[PDB]
Structure 1
Amino acid sequence: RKLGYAILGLGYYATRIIMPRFAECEHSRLAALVSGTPEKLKTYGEQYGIPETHRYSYETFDRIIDNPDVDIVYVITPNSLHRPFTERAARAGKHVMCEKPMANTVADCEAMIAACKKAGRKLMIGYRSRFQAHNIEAIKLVRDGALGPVRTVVTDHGFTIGDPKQWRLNRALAGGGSLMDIGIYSLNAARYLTGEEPVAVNAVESTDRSDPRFGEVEDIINFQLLFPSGATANCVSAYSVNCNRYRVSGPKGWVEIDPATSYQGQAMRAQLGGPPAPREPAPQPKNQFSAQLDHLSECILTGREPIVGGDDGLKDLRVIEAIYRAAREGRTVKL
């Protein structure tokens, strides 16, 4: 049994990364395309064998309610559009995969969750790293007690963003700067490595407003998290440096991945009672993208809840709001 995906928003991630990876799925198939660019519907419709009956504009998208080949809509648009397309998908009776960050605000996340609940449909956020072999290995090491209690998580995510005109640098479409786009990986990792939710947050922002990229959103916003167990995290979020890594440490040792949450190329090193050494993770059945797609499908087929549901996305936005507030107010924000 394969559930049918409609891919909505035929941009870079949709077309270069996600759509080719239906090849390795076991419970998912590409069934429909939704785009605001007619030429893309032609181009990708022809490449992927999607008939014209299964091609939608944003104007005709609500008609997808009458298409039984579509079980799931995967929303891969700028951040500010996640909420309205998720709600429309839910009202069309479809389950929803929504890219990160879930939405611009806590309230918007709550609205999305309510819409999917009202529709009796599932909602999953695209945290692909939870399906990635090295990340799974790190999480398991922590849970097995190989490090002892988690004491520190040090995680850096950033890239040198380019074109100042792109939607990521536009507040109305992005909802925020580096934290919304790439820093969220540092936050999400601190949460899944500790398995906890933070109770206190510090942050410092640094943005050169004379830079043509940064008239509207932030460049650097680094943050600290404290967790109930006493675990701590130091996190970097940046649009002016390249980094992608984390190290989690406890009294018995530590494990790190660098790059950690990239599309490929993960490398893990660990220090666990002996010397620091490369560590190969247990093999996964398929790549993180196909695994992410199949997870939602399998949840629907078995009546289970996604491991990264709307609530996970909401929990991130809750902390993101606190990070922005901590930097704005120059004080520790309690959660």
Structure 2
Amino acid sequence: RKLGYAILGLGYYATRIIMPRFAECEHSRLAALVSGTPEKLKTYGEQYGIPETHRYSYETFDRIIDNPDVDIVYVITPNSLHRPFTERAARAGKHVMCEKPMANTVADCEAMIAACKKAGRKLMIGYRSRFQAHNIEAIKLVRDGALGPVRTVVTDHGFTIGDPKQWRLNRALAGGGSLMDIGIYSLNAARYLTGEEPVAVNAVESTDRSDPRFGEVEDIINFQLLFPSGATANCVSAYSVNCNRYRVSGPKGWVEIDPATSYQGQAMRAQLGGPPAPREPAPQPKNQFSAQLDHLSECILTGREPIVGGDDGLKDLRVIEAIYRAAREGRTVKL
């Protein structure tokens, strides 16, 4: 049994990363396309053998309610458009996969969660790293007690962003700067590595406003998290340096991945008992993208809850709001 996906927003992540990976899916198939660009419907429709009956514009999208080949809508638009397409998908009676960050604000996440709940449909956020072999290995090491209690997480995510005119540097479409786009991986990892939610937040923001990229959104915003167990996190989010990594440490040792949350190329190093050494993780049957896709399908087929549901996206937005507030007010913000 395979559930049918409609892919909505045929941009870089949809066409270059996600759509090719239906190949290794065992419980998901590409069923429909939704796009604001008629040429893309034709190009990708022909490539993937999607009939015109299964190609929608953003104006005809609501008609997808009458397409029984579509079980799931995967929303892969700019951040500010996640909420309205998710709500429309839910009203069309479809389950929803929504890319990160979930939405601009906590309230927008709550609205999305309520719409899917009202429709009796499942909602999952695209945190692919939870299906990635090295990340799973680090989480399991922590959970198995290999490190002892988690004491620190140090994690940095950033890339040197380019074209000033792209939607990620436009507040109306992006909802914020590096933190919304790439810093969220630092936050999400801090949460899944500790298995906790933070109770206190510090942040420092640093942005050169004379740079043509950064008239509207932030470049650097680094933050600290305190958790109820006493665990701490130091996190970098940046649009002007390249980094992608984390190290989680306890009294018995530590494990790091660098790059940690990239599309490929992960490398893990651990210091457990002896000197630091590379560690190979248990391989996963499917790559992280196909695994993510199949996870939602499998949840729907067996009536289970996604491990990264709407609530996970919302928990991230709650901390993101506090991070921005902490930097603005120059104080420790309590959650």
For Structure 1 versus Structure 2, the TM-score category normalised by the shorter chain is over 0.9
Cα distance in 2 for residues equivalent to 1:180 and 1:149:
29
Alpha-carbon distance between aligned partners in 1 of 2:143 and 2:122, rounded to the nearest angstrom = 27
CA shift for structure 1 position 78 = 0.1
* Partner Cα distance (1:332, 1:166) in 2: 33
What SS does the corresponding residue of 1:39 show, helix, strand or coil?
helix
> Counterpart in 2 of 1:92?
92
Provide Cα deviations, 1:291-318, integer angstroms capped at 9, x if missing partner.
0000000000000100000000000000
In structure 2, how many angstroms separate the alpha carbons of the residues matched to 1:283 and 1:268?
A: 13
Q: Structure 1 residue 204: deviation in Å?
A: 0.1
Report the Cα offset of residue 29 of structure 1. 0.0
With normalisation by structure 1, the TM-score equals 1.00
The CA deviation string for residues 22-55 of structure 1, in whole angstroms up to 9 with x for no partner, is 0000000000000000000000000000000000
How big is the shift at 1:283?
1.1
What's the secondary structure of 1:184's corresponding residue? helix
Cα distance in 1 for residues equivalent to 2:271 and 2:330: 36
Q: Residue 203 of structure 1: CA displacement?
A: 0.0
CA–CA separation in structure 2 for the residues paired with 1:274 and 1:168: 43
Q: Which residue is equivalent to 2:296? A: 296
Unpaired segments of 5 or more residues in structure 1? none
Q: Distance in 1 between matches of 2:87 and 2:150?
A: 38
* Percent identity of paired positions between Structure 1 and Structure 2: 100
Match of 2:104 in 1: 104
Question: Take 1:257 and 1:46, find their aligned partners in 2: how far apart are those partners?
Answer: 39
Mapped to 2, the partners of 1:148 and 1:182 lie a distance apart of 29
Q: How far does residue 134 in structure 1 lie from its aligned partner after superposition?
A: 0.1
Q: Which residue of 1 aligns with 2:319?
A: 319
1:176 corresponds to: 176
Runs of 4+ displaced beyond 3 Å: none
Instruction: Please name the residue that 2:55 is paired with.
Output: 55
Shift of 1:252: 0.3
Q: For the residues of structure 1 that align with 2:271 and 2:217, how far apart are their CA atoms?
A: 38
Alignment partners' CA distance in 2, 1:274 and 1:32: 52
Matches within 5 A, 1:172-211: 172-211=172-211
Correspondence 1:17 to 2:24: no
Gaps of 5+ in 2: none
RMSD: 0.2
Q: CA deviation at 1:275?
A: 1.3
CA distance in 1: counterparts of 2:200 and 2:262, whole angstroms: 28
Q: Offset of 1:3 from its aligned partner?
A: 0.1
- Output aligned runs, 1:64-103, within 5 Å: 64-103=64-103
Shift of 1:130: 0.1
> Alignment partner of 1:271: what SS?
strand
Looking at structure 1, the residues matched to 194 and 129 of structure 2 have their Cα atoms a distance apart, in angstroms, of 15
Aligned residue for 2:296, secondary structure, equals helix
What SS does structure 2 have at the residue aligned with 1:114?
helix
Q: List per-residue Cα deviations over 1:171-208 (Å, max 9, x = no partner).
A: 00000000000000000000000000000000000000
Paired with 1:278 and 1:239, the residues of 2 have a C-alpha distance of: 29
Aligned positions, number? 335
SS of alignment partner, residue 161 of structure 2: coil
How far the C-alpha of 1:157 sits from its partner, in A, is 0.1
Distance in 2, matches of 1:273 and 1:227, equals 26
Task: Report matched runs for 1:223-238 at 5 Å.
Answer: 223-238=223-238
Q: Aligned partners of 2:275, 2:290: CA distance in 1, in Å?
A: 35
